[PDB]
């Protein structure tokens, strides 16, 4: 309609309006006396209209609602935080052009540029349980979903301390992304020997370059 599309936040409403909201929320920490906050105000109005159905813009006045911004380490204003499903997806400090704002939003609302052929299985086994048959077992089990190119049993130390925990990531590379997708949908969230497995895509370019750190 001819009405205000911005959500006007308070400290009391921040949790339900921002953290529990559906879809992406762009939060602007601002104040009435703030020059650059006024300068981006009409940009945010246009964004709220042009990104309707894809993004909600919200504003928290930090004079009238002083409790929330320090919990996010806000310093200068305006500061923009992009939230999705209760996570902070991106931050941007200070004023910016509409073109810069649209690139900041497009690059962070985008998602992935490609469905990967590589699946990673997390929380599946401990290092003590690894043996020489594990790679072959994963290969035969994941053959139910498609052609398996390669399986990597990767052990990763979780920190610099001597006693740091070691976790296992099992990488399964399929021949084409449609196979990877079937395996992920069928296995993600399933329980295996008392453990809830996470099965998800793993960045293909990283994997192709022997970067198994993600
Ligand atoms: Mg700040
Ligand atoms: Mg700052």
Author numbering: 343 to 556
Sentences from the paper on this structure:
UHM-ULM interactions mediated by multiple ULMs of SF3b1 and UHM domains from SPF45, PUF60 and CAPER-α play a crucial role in AS. UHM domains were first identified in both subunits of the U2AF heterodimer (U2AF65 and U2AF35). Structural analysis revealed that they represent non-canonical RNA recognition motif (RRM) domains with degenerate RNA binding motifs. Using high-throughput screening (HTS) of a highly curated library of 43296 drug-like molecules with biophysical assays monitoring binding to UHM domains, we identified phenothiazine derivatives as inhibitors of UHM-ULM interactions.
To confirm the binding pose of the compound we pursued crystallization attempts with other UHM domains. This approach is based on the observation that the ULM-binding pockets of UHM domains are highly conserved suggesting that our small molecule inhibitors will bind to other UHM domains using a similar binding mode. As expected, the phenothiazine moiety of 7,8-dimethoxyperphenazine occupies the tryptophan-binding pocket. The binding pocket is slightly expanded compared to the recognition of ULM peptide in order to accommodate the three aromatic rings of the phenothiazine. The tricyclic ring system adopts a non-planar bent arrangement due to the presence of the sulfur heteroatom. The chlorine atom snuggly fits into the hydrophobic tryptophan-binding pocket of the UHM domain. The 7-methoxy group of the compound points to the pocket that is normally occupied by Arg337 of the ULM peptide ligand, whereas the 8-methoxy group is solvent exposed. The ion pair of the tertiary N14-amine group of the piperazine moiety interacts with the Glu483 sidechain, which in turn is stabilized via hydrogen bond with the side chain of Lys486.
